[PDB]
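Why this split exists: single-chain examples teach little about how molecules sit against one another. For that reason, every record in the complexes split bundles all components of an assembly together and asks for one structure covering all of them. Below is a record exactly as it appears in the raw files.
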Amino acid sequence: LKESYLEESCSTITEGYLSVLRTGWYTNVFTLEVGDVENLTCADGPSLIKTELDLTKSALRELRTVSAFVLGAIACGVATAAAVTAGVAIAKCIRLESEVTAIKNCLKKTNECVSTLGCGVRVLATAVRELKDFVSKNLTRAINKNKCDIPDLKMAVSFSQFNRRFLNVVRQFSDNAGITPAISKDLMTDAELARAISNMPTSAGQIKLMLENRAMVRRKGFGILIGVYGSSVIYMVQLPIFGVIDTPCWIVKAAPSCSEKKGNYACLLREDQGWYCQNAGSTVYYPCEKDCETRGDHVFCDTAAGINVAEQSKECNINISTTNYPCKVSCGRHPISMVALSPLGALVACYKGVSCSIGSNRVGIIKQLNKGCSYITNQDADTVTIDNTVYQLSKVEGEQHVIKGRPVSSSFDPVKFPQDQFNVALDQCFE
Amino acid sequence: LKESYLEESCSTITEGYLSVLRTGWYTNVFTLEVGDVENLTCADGPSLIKTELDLTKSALRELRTVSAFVLGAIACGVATAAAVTAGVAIAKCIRLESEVTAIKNCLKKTNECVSTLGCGVRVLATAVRELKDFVSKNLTRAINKNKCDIPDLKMAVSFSQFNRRFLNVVRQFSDNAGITPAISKDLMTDAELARAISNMPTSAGQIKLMLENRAMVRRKGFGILIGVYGSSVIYMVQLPIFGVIDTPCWIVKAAPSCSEKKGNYACLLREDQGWYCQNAGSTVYYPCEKDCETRGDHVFCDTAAGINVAEQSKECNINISTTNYPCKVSCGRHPISMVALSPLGALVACYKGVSCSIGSNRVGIIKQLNKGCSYITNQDADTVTIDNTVYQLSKVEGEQHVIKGRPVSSSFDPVKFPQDQFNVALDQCFE
Amino acid sequence: LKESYLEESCSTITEGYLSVLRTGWYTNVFTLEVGDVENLTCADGPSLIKTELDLTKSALRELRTVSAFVLGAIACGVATAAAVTAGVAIAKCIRLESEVTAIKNCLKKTNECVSTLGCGVRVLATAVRELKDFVSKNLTRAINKNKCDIPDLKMAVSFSQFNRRFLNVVRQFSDNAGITPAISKDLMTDAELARAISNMPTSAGQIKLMLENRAMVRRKGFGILIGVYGSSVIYMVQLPIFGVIDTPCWIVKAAPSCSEKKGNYACLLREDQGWYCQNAGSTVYYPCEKDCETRGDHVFCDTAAGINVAEQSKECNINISTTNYPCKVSCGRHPISMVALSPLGALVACYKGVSCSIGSNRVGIIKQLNKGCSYITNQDADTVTIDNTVYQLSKVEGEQHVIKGRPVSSSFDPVKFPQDQFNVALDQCFE
Amino acid sequence: DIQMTQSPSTLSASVGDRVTITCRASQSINTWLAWYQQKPGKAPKLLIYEASSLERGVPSRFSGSGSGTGFTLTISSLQPDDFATYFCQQYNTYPRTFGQGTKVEIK
Amino acid sequence: EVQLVESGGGLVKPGGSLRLSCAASGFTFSSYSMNWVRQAPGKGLEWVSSISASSSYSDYADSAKGRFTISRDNAKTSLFLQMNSLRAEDTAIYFCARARATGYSSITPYFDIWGQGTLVTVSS
Amino acid sequence: EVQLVESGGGLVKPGGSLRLSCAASGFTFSSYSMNWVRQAPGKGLEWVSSISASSSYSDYADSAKGRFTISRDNAKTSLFLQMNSLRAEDTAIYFCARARATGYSSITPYFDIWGQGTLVTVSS
Amino acid sequence: VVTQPPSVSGAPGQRVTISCTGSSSNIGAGYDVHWYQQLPGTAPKLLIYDNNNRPSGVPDRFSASKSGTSASLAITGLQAEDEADYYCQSYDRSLSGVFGTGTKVTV
Amino acid sequence: QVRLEQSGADVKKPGASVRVSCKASGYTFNGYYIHWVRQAPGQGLEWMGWINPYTGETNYAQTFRGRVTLTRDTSLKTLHLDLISLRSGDTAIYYCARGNCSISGCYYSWLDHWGQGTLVTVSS
Ligand SMILES: *[C@@H]1O[C@H](CO)[C@@H](O[C@@H]2O[C@H](CO)[C@@H](O)[C@H](O)[C@H]2NC(C)=O)[C@H](O)[C@H]1NC(C)=O
Ligand SMILES: *[C@@H]1O[C@H](CO)[C@@H](O[C@@H]2O[C@H](CO)[C@@H](O)[C@H](O)[C@H]2NC(C)=O)[C@H](O)[C@H]1NC(C)=O
Ligand SMILES: *[C@@H]1O[C@H](CO)[C@@H](O[C@@H]2O[C@H](CO)[C@@H](O)[C@H](O)[C@H]2NC(C)=O)[C@H](O)[C@H]1NC(C)=O
Ligand SMILES: *[C@@H]1O[C@H](CO)[C@@H](O[C@@H]2O[C@H](CO)[C@@H](O)[C@H](O)[C@H]2NC(C)=O)[C@H](O)[C@H]1NC(C)=O
């Protein structure tokens, strides 16, 4: 990784991240089969089987009831709407009785099937059958004459093992109204996700990536419940397709640049913080804090959460003083001392009335910082102290660079009125 | 549903929703009886009963220790404070020794009671008793002479079944410190919720509604732990009274309307987005993005999260260019191209340098969009593509209408300074 | 508690809270030992042990794959970054083979050890050993000749008890990418947290408070997975050091203050709402709702989530109209009627077109409120009604005071343009 | 700073005899005292790490003893292999400090 | 200047009682923990007692426990030590000191601002 | 205009080596995956190799694997192909083509902008 | 009881180190070590506000460290203004605040 | 076996600088500290400092801080000592040694394995 401190605007750009941007969805339609549990009944009263069988039946009936500018908010609302709308669009396609019949009849001869829905989308299909096999081959043999207080205690313990997955899928869909936020191990075993990843219509580059980053795959995806059908429960797991990969991405973090004249502060803060990537020659901004997740160099984002931004917005990283591009800032009379922790260092803003220091666990106070913004590289010190609050810096190594230049808040006068402004273009703050 | 695209301000209004607004709370004071588990002890050392008994005792001891403008933020906070303040008022009234005695004594003769508390509210009360029955009638007979390596292994498996509910209530209240965010199946079984709904002092309309929408009931409600009282734990579940029903509700969504003046962009975005309803001769706005939840035509909201807004605010949908009402907008020089997915279509803003298309899986590209805002009904296309990001449209069907008119961003000139503004009335953006 | 209503700016300050501010972290490195479960195998096919053993092995191998201005977003973002950056620093000290060997070799002789890591941090270390003891002393003796359908069914039931902790730690770290946001009972038992609190370089004043508030300790902390090292899993729990205690803290809440000028409304809202404390001769503001959890008089905050603010900011409470300090407000033509529920009362704003009342459940309507702001002390009424939405008041008692003064919105004329402004200093709203 | 002190400065010895070597700290370093053997022209080799312990590969005739301020290394029956310089090292503090050395030399 | 200034120390007999008062000035006294430290003539510093910022906690040495009582007024910005059952071994200079803790690695207070000291002589 | 321009094509003896070099211009080259596609005279297009945007991934056809090596310089906006162990079957026009994928249904790249083609002849 | 050498001495410009030693209940319990200076009849001045950390008005020639159960202060470039008492301080899990026995630097 | 192949000898002027090297092998490089230590002929062993090969974090003795700087390359599994402004008193053998750890934790660490000491000569 590489980090440039931008002294002109008290911001850092950390470069060298590799994109993994979610372009589409791969569907695995699970069929989980419970079987004729509701046709079984216990006459004996007190019984471990009866308690387990009643809990199994209750879970099945409850599942029958269940069925599905400040750019950060706007980008993540769009991303949430896009994901569920795409998923429901496939779900709507699978709902047809002829289609669930087709899936069920395919999985009647195999544990795995590929189906092309009438929508022309082709989906994987997977049976979960262990509970039906238990219910049909063993429990229905044990429950003779509706007797259930049987001495074969192994049956009751086994029953609580086989049904555990079913109860958890029911619980997760029941709690989440049928649209789970992440793919539980109960929805899709690792033995099934590895199989799904292998079957994806994707290059081996993504295959290597997706098998290594299985948790990131599992967390970017989601589930939709289709319904219950003849003692089988149908649900779909949506897996991410990462069709933009290895392109450049960089993160901007910023802290308040303030300066005093006539004894009074002028401050600016950059508002265009967060993740940027390049996609197909476009530059794309990911203003939502909740989407882009990082593992080493790889940054994982929903493309739906991206806002397209002119490539000239990079001029706010090199010539924010003089670019004609509307670099988005907030400004005012508000000198907030703070530490912006960054991948390879810290932006330390400290201003009148607040003491600011850096130090090491084995050396003590290494330096006392000047008023202003100090970029403390994470090799300079182990810690930063503000107001006696202690901040610990990252251990990760990398190149740190400084693009020297007179802070904008010093170079230009604040506009006399209205001096405080929110998320405005920089030409509107400074005269 | 019925959606009007409003070309004057790049916004849609989707109508036809039926309110289900939470006006009050119905309390069920659960008593859960654990019994004399603390008097039981095991001499035998290694035992399954000892492991389950020690887990039961530990859960009881830990539970003994547990005890309880940007209008979006302001509305969500007010609703959060209102709910917990409402519930704790009941808890304070239940918590009196004389009242928990009255509840406990009522539930000796029966598993269900109704108590009029001294605060004048009448609450349901429900006994959970299965664990005490197990502890007293069976386990105490099994643990003779403090022996716990009982060869009747059915006892240990049974014990793990009967105590499961207790451990989950403890876990949920322990993790949440006594105020659970939703009513778990462990707090309240479906049979208990259905019984509570039947008892609820409400019309048969809400009864049918609440039984069909049991998950929406279960998710709008919450629980509070009252405390532990010897061999028993007292907790209240709060169920939503839906005292405003079937009134008109509508959702506004908007995307950035921009126009090019001296080659520079002027933009506006409507910021009054989200849900609206008529309540009792007033229109009420629900800016809290987390509250209003939709099932079909029914929109489910907390009335405490509502902000009363003048009936004239509908003029921001009819005639935003000419109304004297202060229509809240943000404006500036910020041409963000994006897709605002909406119930019956999408708003698609695309501007200079961004390519924008609509397509269908079988047709391919149906059309290439003009710069500006296009309302794409969800019948015109399966998808919208921006920058090669593919957005998928809804499949739900309903009337789509266009209220034609020259965009405000074109028909009025932007104010020379300050041109960028946030949450301002529209007369402040355009001269 | 003491609450002053501030009629000059429709705000309350509730005083009398005692700080409990998280200054630092204390580490317990847990070693959980699974043993040679992967060296066990079952030939018999169908078996309770095989189902449990295969589940135990899958959990171990999946864990082998897992490895780790608007001041609110600013401060709570900084606190989130600071916490994980502090924890990962310690994790990287632990991660060394030489150090995990030192930890593991210490825990051979004892279940608890203290380690001074090579980077100088001093950490507790704890062995979780019950599962390895089961696996080695009993299960390995039971699985003779790779038989697993043994009639000693107590083995299988026991196995599903001993592994339960391990499975939950795996599940929690799997779901949370190795950084669990709160310390589960599976990560750290109460018997272990009490031991850690007892073994933690702090005064008995903190010790008593931490043992009383174990749930607040448990939720302010977090866990990091270090990794899996053969037959053992290494993870660390971070406990909060509360090094600032018993200092003064107060909460500001505010509601829209409006006045009618030319028959048209001017409004202001104070934006500096939330928690404040004194630390070591400085005042620190905690601008986000996700940190300062409160129990009784004790307010519990992350010091990293604080923004230092001048001591003169108290003049925005005591006589905001005369102070030259830049009191942060939003102003405009936007008369939102609402109830700001507060510890000892409610700020009720009601303005033209909205009806506002207070009542008691037995009295009925106590009063109908004037247009304006009213501070309803929580002894004046049980409820406030707006628009027929009923808000419940808190039962909690305390001192209530009124700092009388003509509202700023009335005493100063609104600025002609731009009248609507967000998060500006007050001299910019009013001439 | 822990000065370590080591005696005798050299030790004339013969094969089979019981060599014993003393090192004294200046503070209680507990058992945090390694011993090293250096042959001339060679890198040192760890014999004892905790003052009673013994490095995996080294001959069992070497034996460390003592705790706190005073320590010893003993060779139970010296072999012609064993004639070398020896160092103690404390590791209770930074800097790591070493004894001045003693050479076991042929009588 | 930030100043702590002790007063009320003097000569008392064994079994005597005395009340030290230390006036704090120049700092936000309600924010800080406050300690009394004593120095027997020709001897080292002994910690006597501690009071927390809002008086919710107090601790004493085993020599002072039960005998002494530490208290504060945050409005008059004054720290007080009642001493009862004084002894010859209590003859010392008593310093009030402002207590401050970093709290990152541990909670042990340093004493940053120290008063002038008042002598206390306990003899018959 | 967006242009890809191959160079380094020429005559080689069997067993010989050649290094093709395609200059990219008019587009943000670092944003795109880049490929080599070859056409034997009178035959169809054979895909030769692919390199990802930051070179982190590369793939080759079974005829090229081990023999050839694709590389890119993102600063000089140039795509290269080292070809070792050339054969008569390697006589073809080689096109550099900008690869692009809409990863909605699947990740298969289309090739949108194509170079001029440079001709490689391999004969004794 | 945290313990210190009664006096240390050095010529001007020499380096003098003051040792501070403790037990499993104070310095060994993880409580940090602070250092104080006291000229005759003066109130103590804080020299090291934590391990290692110097406040303002304490020249860079003062230095301190903590190492398990013990701690140290080293005055480099010893000068006539340094001829003072010095006390280490920590906290004891049972005895609460513990000062060391104090050291007179003699120049 | 664990082997620390150090650099051969070199000779330098006073005021020059020297970069010693130590190639690690046979051990999981990132997992164990490396200590650098010094032996001036006629004097006892002297500790330079240590480096953590995982993070590259270092400690330097008070007598070498500012003059020394340790470094590692995790790809070459190689360690380096850089020492600036040499003196006649820096005529010594420099050693590379792998740390191993007490059950008290790696703060308490001894030197299991040592490299062939690089003698460095500083002279006019
Ligand atoms: C479920 O039924 C199957 C088939 O009857 C049982 O499988 C048998 O298990 C025994 C061991 O207990 C083996 O000796 C047989 O060879 C197995 N037969 C087959 C066809 O697999 C099984 O035990 C029953 N119970 C469970 C929990 O699976
Ligand atoms: C708990 O105790 C009751 C009463 O002794 C047991 O109930 C009996 O159960 C058997 C079946 O196992 C029936 O045949 C009897 O008619 C039942 N008697 C009554 C009075 O209900 C019960 O089995 C015990 N265990 C559990 C788990 O309930
Ligand atoms: C590092 O030092 C440790 C001691 O701290 C050595 O551990 C000893 O190893 C042997 C052989 O496995 C065991 O017989 C001893 O019981 C271990 N000692 C303790 C205290 O457990 C270790 O061998 C050294 N080397 C490595 C690479 O770890
Ligand atoms: C696990 O194995 C141990 C060891 O066999 C069992 O408990 C011990 O058994 C030996 C005899 O083999 C007795 O001498 C000990 O007194 C027993 N210990 C205790 C504490 O009773 C133990 O029962 C087995 N099962 C479990 C669940 O631990």
